[PDB]
Amino acid sequence: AESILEYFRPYLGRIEIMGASRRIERIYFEISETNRAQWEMPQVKESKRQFIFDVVNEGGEAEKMELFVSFCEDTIFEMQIAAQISEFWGELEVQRVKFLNYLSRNFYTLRFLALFLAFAINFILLFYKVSDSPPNMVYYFLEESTGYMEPALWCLSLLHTLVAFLCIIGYNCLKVPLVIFKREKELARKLEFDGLYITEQPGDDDVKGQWDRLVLNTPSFPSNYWDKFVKRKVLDKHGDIFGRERIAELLGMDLASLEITAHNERLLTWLMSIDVKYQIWKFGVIFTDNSFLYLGWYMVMSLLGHYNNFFFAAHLLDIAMGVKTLRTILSSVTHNGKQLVMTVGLLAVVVYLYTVVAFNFFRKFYNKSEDEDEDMKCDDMMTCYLFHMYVGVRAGGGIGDEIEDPAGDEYELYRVVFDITFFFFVIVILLAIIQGLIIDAFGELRDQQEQVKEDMETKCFICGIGSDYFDTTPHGFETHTLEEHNLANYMFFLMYLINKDETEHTGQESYVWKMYQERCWDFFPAGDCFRKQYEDQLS
């Protein structure tokens, strides 16, 4: 049986769990072609890679398996949200969804196109000229012998605002229905398994935890989450300890006594009959997204461009958000912002300490006054402070390079000491820290990639056993982390249970299914590998 055992490998999944016998077991199942084809895609290949950086670097150990299953569920929803968009009264509603699916299918194309046109407008805008005479001054656009250069500006302007407006609707139907599911799922856990609004209360902070108070009693709370029966489950858990009538009122659930008849007893016209509370709740969630706001603010400037001005010269900054590697250099400088603002703040305090000195002793020196009359930039104290700052730190050679010569007998020594310290402290030292807080950021951001690299190649990531134990066999750690534990079979298993029939589970598929409902993660190996288990008996 070689032809069979070969043609069926890209489908013979293998997982390795423990439980119900206190020993490690092995399971087999069918991955299937449809699920497998959805796993190797650029939109998904990257999500896994960035996820591991968020675990082995800034994550823990006891909660690792918890936040791993959560991610393994965010992917199932993404595979579902994408496998559906692919290819006068009712004749219009059919072409809408057939068009929106085309809008979101190629979203990074539109997102890249608006970057292209921003280089076209800003290329043209490099010709404008000022003139106080028609060809109160006018901004006459200058042309190099070509007349059509300006009529093309009217064309590319309205074209740009178009694609800068379609990117919002594409983003609204593609990446929003997941910033909602991540929050719905997060709320249904703090009620079913905690007492966030039953036993305890939010800590008067974290408005994110407080804004959700107005979505509990809405008619359709779990709109995108799978378990739409979360209400009936919280009730049967705190209905006795707390007031059954009280709890069955906080979650809406009117006619709690008459909420058994549903199980007992089997278009542009009235669309105005929809909920308004939940819609406000969803609105408040979207508007506080750091990506939706920048994507919306990018549309406002492209809107004010019709109010023809130099506003398209601000759309070039999308190269920070656009380019892959350029955004990484900007990460280092933004990695120490909290401790770099407080450093330049230390620069507006030392020169103030150097102003009250030159305001009482060296007033007869700052006489920038040229000839005739008689500047005296030191009389008030809201000018020498603005002379030691606009000119002081920008001088480069201390402040002694803009004042009179100290050749005079009075304070010929007290002023040199005053200047040399001003060159060593607030020029060399206090601006080598700013230049030094960046050099440290690169080393602080380079060793991070080594930790997420030297740990993936040493440990199993599931049982934690180091590779030094597996390599007592040719390609020991090479075959283990690719057949026994694979970080993809453990995901292809959850797709297998949920997409199966409940009366079809085997003896082991059902035991792991019950622990998944109670959110008990004591079936991952975490310590053994079925080789450390049977190394004594046989191979």
Ligand X SMILES: Nc1ncnc2c1ncn2[C@@H]1O[C@H](COP(=O)(O)OP(=O)(O)OP(=O)(O)O)[C@@H](O)[C@H]1O
Could you tell me how far CA 408 lies from the centroid of its own chain?
63
- 376 annotated as ligand-binding: no
C-beta of 452: minimal distance to a second copy in Å?
A: 16
- 483 annotated as ligand-binding: yes
Subset of residues 477 to 496 that bind ligand X, contact rule: CB under 6 A? 481, 485-487
- 487 annotated as ligand-binding: yes
Subset of residues 443 to 472 that bind ligand X, contact rule: CB under 6 A? 456-457, 460-462
Rank residues 362 and 492 by Cβ distance to ligand X and give the closer one: 492
Buried b (16+ CB within 10 A) or exposed e, 498-512: eeeeeeeeeebeebb
* 287 lies in the site for a second copy, by CB under 8 A: no
Give the DSSP per-residue string, 461-505: SSS--BHHHHTTSTTHHHHIIIIIS-SSHHHHHHHHHHTS-GGG-
User: In the set 163, 313, 403, 488, which binds a second copy (CB under 8 A)?
Assistant: 313
- 288 annotated as ligand-binding: no
Rank residues 107 and 311 by Cβ distance to a second copy and give the closer one: 311
* 411 lies in the site for ligand X, by CB under 6 A: no
C-beta of 40: minimal distance to ligand X in Å?
A: 8
Residue 506 token pair: 């085997």
| DSSP E strands, 356-500 | none
C-beta of 201: minimal distance to a second copy in Å?
A: 46
* 342 lies in the site for a second copy, by CB under 8 A: yes
CA distance 75 to 224: 14
* 17 lies in the site for ligand X, by CB under 6 A: no
* 420 lies in the site for a second copy, by CB under 8 A: yes
Subset of residues 362 to 401 that bind a second copy, contact rule: CB under 8 A? 363, 379-382, 385-386, 389-390, 393-398, 400-401
- Residue 347: what residue type? L
Report the residue closest to ligand X, judged by CB.
Answer: 487
Subset of residues 315 to 334 that bind a second copy, contact rule: CB under 8 A? 316-317, 319, 323, 325-326, 328-329, 333
User: In the set 113, 149, 438, 488, which binds a second copy (CB under 8 A)?
Assistant: 438
Residue 225 token pair: 């989450």
# chain residues binding a second copy, by CB under 8 A: 80
> 131 by DSSP, 3-state: which?
strand
* 116 lies in the site for a second copy, by CB under 8 A: no
Subset of residues 387 to 406 that bind ligand X, contact rule: CB under 6 A? none
CA distance 212 to 285: 9
- 460 annotated as ligand-binding: yes
Helix locations, 305-361, DSSP H: 318-322, 326-333, 338-344, 347-358
* 10 lies in the site for a second copy, by CB under 8 A: no
86 contact, one of a second copy, ligand X, none, CB 5-8 Å limit per kind? none
Buried b (16+ CB within 10 A) or exposed e, 253-276: beebeeeeeeeeeeeeeeeeeeee
Q: What is the DSSP-derived secondary structure letter of residue 277?
A: H
CA distance 306 to 302: 8
Backbone region of residue 81 per phi and psi (left: phi > 0; alpha: psi in -120 to 50; beta: other values): alpha
- Other CB atoms within 10 Å distance of the CB of residue 281: 20
The binding site for Ca(2+) consists of: 503
The binding site for caffeine consists of: 226
- Residue numbers at the binding site for ligand X (CB under 6 A): 45, 49, 456-457, 460-462, 481, 485-487
The binding site consists of: 45-49, 226, 456-461, 481-487, 503
